[PDB]
Amino acid sequence: GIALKNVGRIKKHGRKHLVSKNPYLRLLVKLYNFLARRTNANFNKIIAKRLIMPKRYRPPLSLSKLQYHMANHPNDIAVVVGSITDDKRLFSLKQLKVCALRFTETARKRIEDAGGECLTFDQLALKYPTGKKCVLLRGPTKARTAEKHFGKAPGKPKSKARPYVRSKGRKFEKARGRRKSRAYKK
Amino acid sequence: IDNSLNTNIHQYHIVGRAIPTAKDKNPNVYRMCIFAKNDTNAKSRFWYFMKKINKLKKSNGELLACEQIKERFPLRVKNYGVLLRYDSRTGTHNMYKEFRDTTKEGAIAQLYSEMAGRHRARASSINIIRISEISSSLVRRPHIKQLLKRRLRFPALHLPTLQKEYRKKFASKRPSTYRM
Amino acid sequence: AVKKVGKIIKKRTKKFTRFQSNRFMRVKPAWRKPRGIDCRVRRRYKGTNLMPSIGYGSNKKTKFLLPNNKYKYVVKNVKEMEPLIMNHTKYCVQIAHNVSSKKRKQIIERAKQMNVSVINAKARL
Amino acid sequence: AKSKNHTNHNQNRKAHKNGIKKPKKHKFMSRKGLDPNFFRNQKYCLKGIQKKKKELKLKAKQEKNN
Amino acid sequence: KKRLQNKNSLTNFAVRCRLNPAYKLLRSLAVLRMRKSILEKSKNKKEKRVQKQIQKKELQKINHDYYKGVAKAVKKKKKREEKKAK
C-alpha cells in the first residue's frame, strides 16, 4: 500500500492518435511527428499536434483573416492546419504564400490569380523543414454555433447561452423568466 | 557479560536552563539526576519535571548537560533507601523502600519490579525522589536488616535451572530436588 | 504451481473453472466472472475458486510457442506451406482437421522435404 | 416512514475530492455599475489618449510614406 | 540503457572506487594504520595514561561536587519536613 494520486500513474488528456483513417493524412502525421521527434522545432511539434486534432479544432480560415494576419510580414508563409475558404467580402488579394490542409476551389483560384500559391504540408516539410519564415495561424475555434449554447446555462443570471428551441418567434420561450413583466428576467 | 541478566536502567545527570529573555538575563540553571532506559527518555523526564515544578517547558528551555553517571564500585554491595511518590487507582501516596545491591540503577530496577508486583503501579505512575545509600546502622526494613548479620549462611533450596541442552524430555529416573 | 521447462515457464496450469460448476449440471465449467452481490469468489474469500487475472500472463518472449519451442501454424493444403520455407525452425505445422487422406500425405511429404516438423503427423492412417 | 432529515457526513470528502477550487482572479473586472462620473471620465481620458496617439502615428506614417 | 545487476556499492571494490575516487586511498591508509605492531602501544600505554592524572582529578571533582549538591538538597528537604512535622 502506497499513498499516491491516481495510484501513481501519470494521466494525460486529449488525443493520442489520429482517428481519421485517411491514408494521406496518416502519411502526413507520420512525416510530421518524425520531424517533431528528430528536429527540435516546436513549430514541427505544434504542427504534428494540430494534424491530430478533431475537425472542430481545425476551423476554416478566410482569405480576409489570412491577409490581415500576414499584413505585416509579406515575405513569410502562412501555415494553417485547417482549410482556407474564400471571403466574398474581401475586394482584393495580394501575393499570398500559404500552406494549408485544404483549399476551397474559389480560395485557390483567387490565390493563384493574385499571384501567390497554395502549398500542402508535404511541400512545406520539403522546403521549410524547421519552419523559418513560417507564421503558424489558426481560425476561430470558439466561433462555431455549438459553442453559443455552452457555458452557463441559459437561465443563469447574466448568461449569454443560446437556448435549444424549435423557433424564435414571440411565442417561443420569451415570456416568463425572460422579461420583468412575467415573474423574473433571466 | 550476560544481556539476559542485565537490565537497562541507567542514571543520567541532566542540566538545563530557560532560554534567556529580555525579562531575565541569567535564568537559574536547573540540575537533576534521574533514571531512564536511555538518555532520550532521561531528557524527556527532565523536561517533564521542569514543566511540573518550574514554569519552564522544552520550547522555552535549552539543555546544558546530559551525561551518564556510572557506579564507582559496581561490585561492592551497598544498601539503598529510596523515597517514592506514586499514584494508585484511588489516590497518591509516598513510601520509602529499601533495597541492597551493587548499583543505584539495579536498585531502581528492583523498585520498579516490586512496585509492579505488589501495588500494580505502572512506571508511568512512579516518581523517584531521593534514592541514596544508607549505612547498615539505620537500615529500617526487616527484610534488609536480616541480610546484614555478622556471618550469613543458608541452604540453596532452589530448584535446578539446567541448560536447554540438558533439559531433556524423558528421564531415566526421577531426579532429586533435595540436591547437595 | 508454476511449470518450468527450458526457458518456457507456464505460470499456472489447471485452467480456471466456473464457480459452482462442480455441483450444478446446468453450469458449465467454462469460466465466467461472477457478478453477484455476496458472491464469495467475487469477494475473494480464501479457499474458493480464485479468478483469472492478467498477472498470470506468460512472458511475451515465450508466449505462443509449443513444447517443441516453436509456434504452430495450421495448414489446409500444400499451398499454405510456402511461408514456412523461410522459418522452418521457428514454426511447426499442424494439418487442419477437415483435410482428407488425399491431401494429408501430400502435406506430410512436402513438410518432410521442407524440413519442418508436423504436429499431428500420424492422423488418419 | 421516518427519513434521515439531515447530515453533513461525507460532504467534506466530496468537496476535497476535486479540491477546493479557487476563483480564477482575472486581471480586469467589468466596471458596469461602479463609480459613474468617474469611469465616464476615464472613458474620455482613454478616448483622448487614443486620439493623440493615433494622430501622431498617422503623421509619422504619412511623412514616411510620402 | 538496459538494466543490469545493481552492484553492491559497499563491498564490490571496483564499483566502490568508481563511486568514491578517494576510497582506495582512505582504505589503504586505514590498513596501514592497522598494520602497526604491539610493542609501541605496550610501552606507551603508561605514558598515555599517566598524563591523564589531571584529567581524572578534574573529572573526580565535578562528580564529587554533584554528589555534595545532591546530599545537601536531601538534607535541606529532610530539615524542612522535620520543621513542618511539629
Add this chain to the structure above:
Amino acid sequence: AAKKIKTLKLINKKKRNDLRQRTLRYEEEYESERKKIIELKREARKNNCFYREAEKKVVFVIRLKGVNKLPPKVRSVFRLLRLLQVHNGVFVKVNKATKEMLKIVEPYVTYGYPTLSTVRKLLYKRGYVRVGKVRRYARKKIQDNADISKHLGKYNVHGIEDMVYQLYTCGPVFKKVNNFLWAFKLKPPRKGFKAKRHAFNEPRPGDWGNREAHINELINRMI
C-alpha cells in the same frame, strides 16, 4: 571529429580529480569537527561551566503506520515530506516550519539524528535517485556519478560523497540533494519493533517519537 571523445575523457579526468580533492577535504572537516567537539567539552569540564552543542540540523524520519485510517492533515504532511509507504524514510532539514510539521505527524513516525556512517551507508546501500526530466523521474539506483553530475552538477555537487556531505551537514545544497534523492524504501527491522503503538519516550516499550541518536541502531537493522 575524434577530438570530442578525447576532450570528454580529459574533462572526466578533471572531474574525478577535484571530486577526490573535495572528498579528502570533507574527511578532514569531519575529523576536525570531532576533535574540536571533544576538546571543547574537555575545556568546559575543566572550567566551571557548561557547553551545549548545536542541534544536528538534519533529521532522518521513517514512517511507521500504513495508508489506512489517517486524518487528512496527517496525510497532507506525509505527502509533503514524501513518506508515502509504511517503511519509507527521508531526510528533513530541521527548522521551525518542518519541526511544526513533524509535530502533527509524530505518533506515526520515528526520527532521529543520522550520523555520518549511517548517512553514508544509507546512500550507498539504499540510495536511489530521480533521473528523468522534471515530473518524469524514473527512480534508478546510483551505481555511478554520471546522473548526479548531470542533474546536480551546477551546484558543484557531482559525486555521491558530495551528496553525503551535503546531507550530513545541512549544507547550502540540501533541498536540491534531498529532492533529487528518492525516498528510501527500508526493510523491516532485523530484530523487530518494540511497540509501534506507543511513544519511544513512554516508560513502557514503544516506538514512535524522536529517538535522537538512537535512530542509527534502528536504521542499521532496517537497512
Add this chain to the structure above:
Amino acid sequence: KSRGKRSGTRYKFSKKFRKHGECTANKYLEKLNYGDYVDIVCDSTQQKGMPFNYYHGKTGKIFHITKRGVGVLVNKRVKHRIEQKKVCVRIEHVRKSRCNEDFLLRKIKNAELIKEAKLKNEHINIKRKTEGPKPAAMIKVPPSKIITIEPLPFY
C-alpha cells in the same frame, strides 16, 4: 426554522464592555484606496451598511469606493469551491487591514538594503530566515546559581 439576517449574532454584534457608543470621529478620516486590503468588522452602533454575519472579521481588497461606502471583494467557501463575493458596507464597518504591513515594511527595508549591497558589490540573502537550530554555546554560570531539582512529595 430561523435564518434572519442577524440570527445568531447575539455576541458577535454586541459592543465590548465599556466600549459602547458611536464610532470615534477620527475613524471617518481613514484613507482608503482601490485595491488595498481591508478588514470587515461590524460596528453595531451603525445599522445601515452593516455587513452580513459571515463576513465579520474577514479580509478582502477594495473593488469599489462610494461617497460613504466600500465594496470589498471577499472569498467565501461554498461546499466544493471558494468564490468571490462583492460585499457593500459603510465606512464604520471597515478598517485598514494590517495583513500587509509586514510585507510593506519588508519591501522598503529590503530595497534600502539591496541598494547599499549592490553599491558595495556584496551578495546578500534577502529572503526571510525561518530561524531554526541554534549554534553551540560556551556558557558560564556561578556554582551558587545551579540549583538541584527533585520531584516533590504528595500532600
Add this chain to the structure above:
RNA sequence: AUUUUAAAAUUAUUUGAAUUUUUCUUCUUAUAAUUUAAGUUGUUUCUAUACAGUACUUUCUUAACCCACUCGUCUUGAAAC
C-alpha cells in the same frame, strides 16, 4: 552491427611526485593483459549409446495437511429461522 564503450579495479613492466615510510601506500606516464568492471559460467556424471517402459511429459481417480456456509436478489446489514 558504431557505449558489455569509456573509465574503475587488479596483475606485469614504466614515468615523476607525494606521504602516513611502504611485500594490498597513494597520485600519473605509458604499454599489455585480465575482472573485482560490463545481471553465471565451467567440469564430471546421468538421461543414454532409447524410440515409449516400471523412466520422463500429461490427464484422470484416489488419499493426506491447511482452508472452504447456497447461489441469485432487495437491503446498512444474508449462510440466514
Add this chain to the structure above:
RNA sequence: CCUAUUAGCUGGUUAUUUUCGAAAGAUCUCUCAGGAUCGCUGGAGUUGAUUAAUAUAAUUUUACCAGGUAGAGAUAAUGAU
C-alpha cells in the same frame, strides 16, 4: 375486442480481460418507496506544463485579524441562594 391499457411498485435482465470509479448530502416538488437540479463519477477534447519553476497545496513558518466554547465568577452586572 379497445389492449401488448397504465403501474412512482415486485421479479428477471445472457461472453472475457484491462483501466477509471461513486452516492446514500443539498434545493424545489400534492413531495417522503418518485422526480428534476447541484454535488460525487466516466468518456471525449483543448489549453498548459514538460525549464527539480511557476501556477498549485485538507501542511507548516512569519506578520496581522475575528471569536466568547471549555474554564472562571457570584464580593463584576442580571437571575438565583
Add this chain to the structure above:
RNA sequence: AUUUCACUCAUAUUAAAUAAAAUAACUCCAAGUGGGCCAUUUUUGGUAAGCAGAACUGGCGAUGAGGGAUGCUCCUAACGC
C-alpha cells in the same frame, strides 16, 4: 485614474519552509446515486436501550488478507503472478 517614456527591485537556491506540485486548468456529453450504517471524541431527548436526533474524522457499504477461537465496522494492514 489611465497612457508613454525613463532608472531598477533577490533570481548564481528561487522576495519564508516543504512538496512522485502540470496526475494541472478549462469545456462538452453522460451514467449511477439522492433509504445509509458503525467506531473514537462532542452533544440533544430519554430511566435506559444493539433507542431517536445531530457535529468532526475515519471506516463498513463497495473489501478481501494476518490477528481478535467466533463476528460486515476492532488491531495490523488494504490485494497482479
